[PDB]
Amino acid sequence: MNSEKFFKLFRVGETVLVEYSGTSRAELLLYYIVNNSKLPIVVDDILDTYYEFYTRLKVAGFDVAPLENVQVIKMGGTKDIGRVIGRLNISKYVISEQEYMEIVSQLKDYPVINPVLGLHKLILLGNTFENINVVKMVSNYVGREERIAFYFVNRNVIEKHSSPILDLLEEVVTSILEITDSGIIIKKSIKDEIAGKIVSPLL
Amino acid sequence: MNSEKFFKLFRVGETVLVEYSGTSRAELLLYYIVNNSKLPIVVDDILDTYYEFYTRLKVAGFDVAPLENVQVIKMGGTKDIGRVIGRLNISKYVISEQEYMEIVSQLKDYPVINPVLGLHKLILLGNTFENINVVKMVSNYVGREERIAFYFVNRNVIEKHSSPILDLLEEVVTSILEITDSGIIIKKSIKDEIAGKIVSPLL
Amino acid sequence: MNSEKFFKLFRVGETVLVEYSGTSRAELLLYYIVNNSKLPIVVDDILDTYYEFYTRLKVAGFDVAPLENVQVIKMGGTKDIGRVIGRLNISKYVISEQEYMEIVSQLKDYPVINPVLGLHKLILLGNTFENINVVKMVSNYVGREERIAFYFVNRNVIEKHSSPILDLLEEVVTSILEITDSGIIIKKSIKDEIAGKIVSPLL
Amino acid sequence: MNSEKFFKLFRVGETVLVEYSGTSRAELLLYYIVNNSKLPIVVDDILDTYYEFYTRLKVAGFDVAPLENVQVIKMGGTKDIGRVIGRLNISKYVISEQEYMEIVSQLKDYPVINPVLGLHKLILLGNTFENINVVKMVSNYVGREERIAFYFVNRNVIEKHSSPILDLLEEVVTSILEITDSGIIIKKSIKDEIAGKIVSPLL
Amino acid sequence: MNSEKFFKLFRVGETVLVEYSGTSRAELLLYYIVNNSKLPIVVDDILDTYYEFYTRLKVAGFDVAPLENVQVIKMGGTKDIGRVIGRLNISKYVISEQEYMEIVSQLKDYPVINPVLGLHKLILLGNTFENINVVKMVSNYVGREERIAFYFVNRNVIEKHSSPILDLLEEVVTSILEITDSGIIIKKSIKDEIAGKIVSPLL
Amino acid sequence: MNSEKFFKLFRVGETVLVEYSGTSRAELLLYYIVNNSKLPIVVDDILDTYYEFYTRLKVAGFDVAPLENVQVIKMGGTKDIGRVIGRLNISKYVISEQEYMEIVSQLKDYPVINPVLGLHKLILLGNTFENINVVKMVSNYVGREERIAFYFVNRNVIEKHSSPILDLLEEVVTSILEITDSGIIIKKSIKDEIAGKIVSPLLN
Ligand SMILES: [Cl-]
Ligand SMILES: [Cl-]
Ligand SMILES: [Cl-]
């Protein structure tokens, strides 16, 4: 389907959890979301995960120019991809809400489509206490109508490291998508009209 | 069913465990209880869990005025939602029974519906000794006629952290409801007849 | 069946393990055993577990006078229910054998029905060596004709905390009953005539 | 089946592992072997396990005189049952072989039936290194024609504590019996073909 | 099935994860790749793993001269096989990518087929933090058109040591092959069509 | 089939993993390999495991003279069974490869059937790092044509202690045999013709 038709499945302010595995080729959905987007794209890049998506798409033969043109907010890492507009540090595997808000202030083209890559990395690295703060990190932004956030997370990484943390994560978001071989399953949604349905937006 | 009928399933003094998961959208049931209750609402908000429920409902388009109008006793956390009448500290992942009673003594309109949110968070953070004190906290109030308590807990979070603790919790409460896709199961009840039955008060 | 016929399933000196879960509402079987008992009742109350049973029954509308009139030996705890004839301190999660006998001497008119509540708590809290001491505490009393003991234990609490202890426990007792939704399963018994059979004495 | 027939399944020098569970009432088999023995009986009583078996049989109504007349070597424990001809301390959850032999040197009527009770307790108490020493002790006696040893072990206790240890144990013994609800299964035997067969000697 | 058609499944710059187990005889596939590659072969030999593949093929009766003539970069280990053009010390279970780059600067006949052997050894040895740096090492080269890398990893070793790590690895590579008894499963590929298909190039 | 045919399933230089369990009575297969053998037999006895196999066979009624007259290289242990031609020290649950070669230097007959007993014990006793060294110890001798080694290992003991280690072990060997009640399964082999097949060599 058309890019903007897909976004119509969500409301401004939502936090969407996109669960995928290593065989899912999640970078394809990320490309679909960024390519020819009608709204401004802002990527929160955790631990150089955007660079990984980028290189995989580049090798696949995609035109990565669109990925290079979006604005990015790095949280750790040393490989800059896209228009970096901010660089936050990660202490105790969590960012500074103070610094983060000071960075988005330079944005004024709201609303924006906000993909967040690499959250599962932070979770794998920390203990229960630090994992809980990472989730608080996510729930702290749910509802801010400045954007629609898409948290791409490798489901298995989180499940196997700490199953309780995955459950907390699915609880605080408003919608949950799961990339499977036959398409994208809408596990949870604000619109009961689409809950449990499977869509194939890339067709 | 009627909201007046749903509440009839319980009697004053009961402690009801409401088990849910990340895909349950448990906030819908909380909203239902808050918006259809004819008694005063007193929420025990553990670690800003109420703010998360409120935020999810708000984004979902619900009129959340009823939520801001209830009385709230905060245990930890920093996000105020509703009329906060007390703030307790989470020392050793538990709360003082003395300081709590000191706060609830300022209430006169009894009985009340008392939703408790975030207990699983407390449990997830503590060890077995601390978890036991949390369970003891819950059993110490079972039977007090000034209210009917609804403990909303993310079942998976507790079961994966300490399965024994989840079973202790289920033992000490008088009723147990579990939210599923088909509806709400009454897993345990004072009424020996309803056990195992499923109801859909929100349809 | 009327309680006194239920008691005929056992022989004086027996130690009966009553296995239940949080959804069993085991307090119902306890009430049945205590109410109108023709044999004296002596309750060993571990860590205020008797108060929890009492409280759930009271809220359920039972006439709990019978529970307040039986003799009780408390092991730890601060909630007094019934005629407390003794208070024993808990050290390393077991009770002094000397102190216990020192207390049971002030008793006459044997045999007695001896409900023991809360053993699973001692196991959940103690270390592996203390868990073994708990089982040892239980086996020390098997065979004494002055009573028939009923150890009410939350099966899941023990098995999910330390499966080996449950096995040791089941081995030292003479009879094992398991409360299920369909009735009480007699998992083990001295009488090969009832082993594997299910009875419903509460009807 | 009669005593002599059952014993013909084994030859002198053999070490037989008798696996059971809490619900098996293994004391019935021990009674069968003791009461029906033309050979002298010598029991290795580890951590008062003989006393436990004794007590269960007594409460069951069995005539425990035959158990009181066997010679016993105690390893730890404080409950004396039978004619104690020796007492040994358990160092690091193992037994000194030089001290054990110094005790059995007083026996002048060979061969004997040697039941060994409570081995799973020594294992539940030790770590891998200490557990390996226990199996070592067991394999050092295999083959000695002065007796036929029957090691009664609670299978689940060992398996849950250390599965590798159970596998090693089964490897060093010459015969393995497992008590089930339908009868005793011969999991391993020097006699080919009877492996996998089930017998009911207590019928 | 084929010879030159095999390499056509991949594009220059790809990173191929080849998953196998102890019963796969994965060396057969390595032999095939080395012996049928028209491009230069450069092997990254981690902890003398090339020597193990080599000895196994030699014993199987294969002509291993082709294995001895490829260029090799040893990462740890003391068993030289092939033509060692560089050696790297292992520190914190990873190597200096900077020194590695210097070592490969001598290569001037690009592209090359780059088999990497023994990665699961570095993973089995390190902790989570170190395992992440190993995966990081792998993702850093994804897309470099100088070669096509085939990482031979014992799947069970990684999965059983750190399941989260296996999922991270599968995520960062562009293609994944899994050796099975029925043939090679293409679990992931830049070509949508072939994903899920099985090929038997060794026929 | 007699040993002669059985050994023909393998070729010199191979390392064969023989997986068994406590109910397998693996000693019977060992007896079959030793009793039956035109080639010289050399047993690597780790932590007195040979004594245990010997004792079980003895109580079973077998003639154990053939086991008493073979050459043995002890790796730890206290029970002397067979003709001990060497004693090796076990440090960090592994054996020095420089000392081993010195002990087999006295061996004039090649090739020899080399049953290695008790490896799972070294693994059960060590951590992951020491286990990996044990595996290296096995892979370092894969391919030496002076013998055909048969490592008798209690699979469950290794599997339950460290599943990864078992997979690593199965990887470095050239053939894998698994003893079951219906016979010996050939889980892996250099000879594709026999792979996956089940044989019952103990049948006369
Ligand atoms: Cl309904
Ligand atoms: Cl009945
Ligand atoms: Cl055959």
Q: F22 vs D174: CB contact, 8 Å cut-off?
A: no
**Chain A residues with beta carbon closer than 8 angstroms to that of E142:** 52, 55-56, 59
Crossing angle of helices B27-36 and B49-59, rounded to 10°: 90
Amino acid, res. B154: N
Tokens of D142: 């295999």
For residue E57, give the H/E element and its range. Answer: helix E49-59
Cα–Cα distance, F86 to F97 (Å, whole number): 14
Residue entry with tokens 């077995």: B128
Tokens of F189: 């082999």
Length of chain D: 203
The experimental technique used to determine this model is X-ray
Task: Determine the structural domain holding residue B195 and report its residue range.
Answer: 2-203
Q: Are C81 and C87 in contact (CB under 8 A)?
A: no
**Chain A residues with beta carbon closer than 8 angstroms to that of E129:** 125
Q: F190 vs E61: CB contact, 8 Å cut-off?
A: yes
Amino acid, res. E29: L
The whole-angstrom distance between A83's CA and the closest CA on chain E is 20
Closest to F147 (Cα-Cα) out of F25, F1, F2, F33: F33
The whole-angstrom distance between E141's CA and the closest CA on chain A is 9
Please, do chains E and A touch (3+ CB pairs < 8 Å)? yes
Q: D174 vs F56: CB contact, 8 Å cut-off?
A: yes
CA of F37 to the centre of ligand 3 (A): 18
Resolution (angstroms) stands at 2.3
Cβ under 8 Å to B: A residues 110-169: 128-129, 132, 136, 139, 142-143, 163-164, 166-169
Q: D61 vs C167: CB contact, 8 Å cut-off?
A: no
Q: Are F120 and F48 in contact (CB under 8 A)?
A: no
Q: Are A46 and A77 in contact (CB under 8 A)?
A: yes
Tokens of D151: 């090691």
Alpha-helix runs per DSSP H in C11-153: 27-34, 49-59, 65-68, 97-104, 119-125, 128-139
**DSSP code per residue over chain A:** --HHHHHTTS-TT-EEEEEE-TTS-THHHHHHHHTT-SS-BEEEEETTHHHHHHHHHHHTT---HHHHHSEEEEES-S---SEEEEEE--BTTB--HHHHHHHHTT--S-SEEEEEE-HHHHHHHS-HHHHHHHHHHHHTTTT-TTEEEEEEEEHHHHHHH-HHHHHHHHHHSSEEEEEETTEEEEEE-SSTTTTT-EE-TT-
Q: F167 vs E161: CB contact, 8 Å cut-off?
A: no
**Chain E residues with beta carbon closer than 8 angstroms to that of F167:** 21-22, 154, 156-157, 160
In chain C the first and final C-alpha atoms are separated, in Å, by 7
**Chain A residues with beta carbon closer than 8 angstroms to that of E14:** 59
Q: How many other C-beta atoms lie within 10 A of the C-beta of residue D110?
A: 14
Cα–Cα distance, E3 to E37 (Å, whole number): 9
Closest to F115 (Cα-Cα) out of F41, F37, F52: F41
Closest to E112 (Cα-Cα) out of E192, E202, E34, E23: E34
Cβ under 8 Å to A: B residues 78-97: none
Tokens of E34: 């080395």
Question: What does the DSSP 8-state code read for residue C94?
Answer: B
Closest to D190 (Cα-Cα) out of D8, D3, D18, D39: D8
Tokens of C48: 């205020």
Residues whose CB falls within 8 Å of the CB of residue E59, separated by 6 or more in sequence, listed in order: F11, F13, F14, F142, F143, F174, F190
Tokens of A200: 């194939």
The DSSP bridge partners found for residue C16 are C150, C175
Q: Are A137 and A96 in contact (CB under 8 A)?
A: no
Cα–Cα distance, B39 to B109 (Å, whole number): 8
Amino acid, res. C22: G
Cα–Cα distance, B7 to D170 (Å, whole number): 59
Cα–Cα distance, A97 to A118 (Å, whole number): 18
For residue C151, give the H/E element and its range. Answer: strand C147-154
From the list F59, F124, F161, which residue is nearest D143 (CB)? F59
In chain D the first and final C-alpha atoms are separated, in Å, by 6
**Chain C residues with beta carbon closer than 8 angstroms to that of B175:** none
Residue entry with tokens 């036959």: A182
Kindly state whether B14 is in contact with chain C, defined as any CB-CB distance less than 8 angstroms.
Answer: yes
Look up the CATH number of the domain holding residue A34. 3.40.50.11570
From the list A132, A143, A188, which residue is nearest B124 (CB)? A132
Alpha-helix runs per DSSP H in D15-162: 27-35, 49-59, 65-68, 97-104, 119-125, 128-139, 155-161
Closest to B83 (Cα-Cα) out of B119, B38, B50: B50
Q: F52 vs D139: CB contact, 8 Å cut-off?
A: yes
**Chain E residues with beta carbon closer than 8 angstroms to that of F187:** 23
| Three-class SS state of B144 | coil
Amino acid, res. D198: I
Residue A139's alpha-carbon distances to A13, A55, A119, B52, D99, in angstroms, are: 12, 30, 13, 7, 67
Q: Is the peptide bond before A111 cis (omega within 30 degrees of 0)?
A: yes
Cα–Cα distance, A54 to D6 (Å, whole number): 74
Cα–Cα distance, C101 to B7 (Å, whole number): 49
What is the number of structural domains in chain C?
1
The whole-angstrom distance between A167's CA and the closest CA on chain B is 5
From the list B164, B171, B176, which residue is nearest C124 (CB)? B164
CA of F3 to the centre of ligand 3 (A): 12
Cα–Cα distance, F64 to F55 (Å, whole number): 9
| Three-class SS state of E87 | strand
